[PDB]
Design a protein around this nucleic acid. Sequence first.
DNA 1: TTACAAC
DNA 2: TACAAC
Lengths: 206, 202
Amino acid sequence: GLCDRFRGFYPVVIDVETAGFNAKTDALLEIAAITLKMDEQGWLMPDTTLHFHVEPFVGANLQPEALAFNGIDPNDPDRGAVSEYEALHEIFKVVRKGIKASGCNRAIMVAHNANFDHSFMMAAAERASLKRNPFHPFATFDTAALAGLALGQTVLSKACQTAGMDFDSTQAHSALYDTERTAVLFCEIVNRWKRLGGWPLSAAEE
Amino acid sequence: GLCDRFRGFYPVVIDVETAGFNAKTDALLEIAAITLKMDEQGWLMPDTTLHFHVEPFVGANLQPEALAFNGIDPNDPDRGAVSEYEALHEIFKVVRKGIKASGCNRAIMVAHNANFDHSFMMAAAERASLKRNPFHPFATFDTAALAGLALGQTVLSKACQTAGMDFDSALYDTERTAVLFCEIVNRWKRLGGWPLSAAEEV
DNA sequence: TTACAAC
DNA sequence: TACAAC
């Protein structure tokens, strides 16, 4: 089961759009989260997906270079952004639920160059004084590393394509879609490892 | 071979001892580094080992709990401590040479919960005002994640034991971490996961 | 209503 | 340089 595969770690794929590279000073603008589930044969696949647009915390820094990269205007009338507390509380609630339903003991962030997203989410969590944050405070499942191992690629787009996934490099990917692509990649990597007899650790001798 | 494996990424195993968890405020006390190499068969293994004790930077923070944990006395005159500049300069110099020799284009840090060690090396490099840092600025190979995939374990000691390694100091940790990284990569190859075409070849 | 693990 | 986690 899911709770057996990673010693009780409930892997949650996360991706964020921001207005800079500094989690402490730069605005969190967007976040998406995908929970995973494992079927009866032990194959991993995407489960539940949430995504929010987030309002820049008070006094937050907005890098013009970053807004040019993601194309987000924090002042767009039609973006319907919620507070960091609103978004994270809902994400945390879903993840806790997933944790109990599957019999895990905590969540771990799955992300591409994971530290980035982990730093922003933890910084926003801390700002909104969210308690009962279910995520590991420093451990992550970074797909860039995992893809380097499995596919010999560290760049998201190329790793997906090498894995046989559809990835349009010419297109800008918002949190929602970057998260989904990352989640499929992670699943593929884990599943192929199992497919080839890497897991269970007795499979190669069965 | 080596530089074909990760698209020119030159994997270097690093482990640091520190006087706290904050990379910007807490002293770096110790660093070890281990380069890797492949044979003609394509099997990964440790190449060279570097080790330095580091003088706390001027005005650095020293968490008593951290010193209790790693048992380092930053004031012991008989620890062969060197400046952050000296240690990283030499490490960077060996890694640059390794990069050129093997035909890679840059280095990537291999470490357990790598962000910790990465943030401390970057902070020190910045402090020492080091130029020519050969390391990728935000990408790493985290053995905790890799071990999560390969061994279903994330804790270093548990992962090493699960891999069939004996696990009982930066030098020790770095060496264990290096061996663990190699076993993970080599097992992937053993099972025919690499190269990609291997699954459809004789 | 810890400690633990990257210190 | 730009690049890639923005």
